[PDB]
Amino acid sequence: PWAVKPEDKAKYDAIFDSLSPVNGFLSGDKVKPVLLNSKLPVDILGRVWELSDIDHDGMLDRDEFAVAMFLVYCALEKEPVPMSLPPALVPPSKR
């Protein structure tokens, strides 16, 4: 299944749409601050964004911004983040 659920991606879509989405995408200029707010270093956001950037277009779409929300909230109370976009984090749009 998808590492992220509908309730976990539902809150991600609110933070993703709280920065002003463009055609379904957020520029690091909207996410960077979203990740810099997790009290984590740019090493987690520099790596959480990448694994979050499913298209590598310099933005986090509703599905990409989702993978970067649990990757940031887990580095605060759960564990760090690896740099290998796991296949369990890919949304259905990448099927």
Partner: peptide
């Protein structure tokens, strides 16, 4: 270039 964090 990319990833505006690092």
């Amino acid at each position: 270039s990319t990833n505006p964090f690092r």
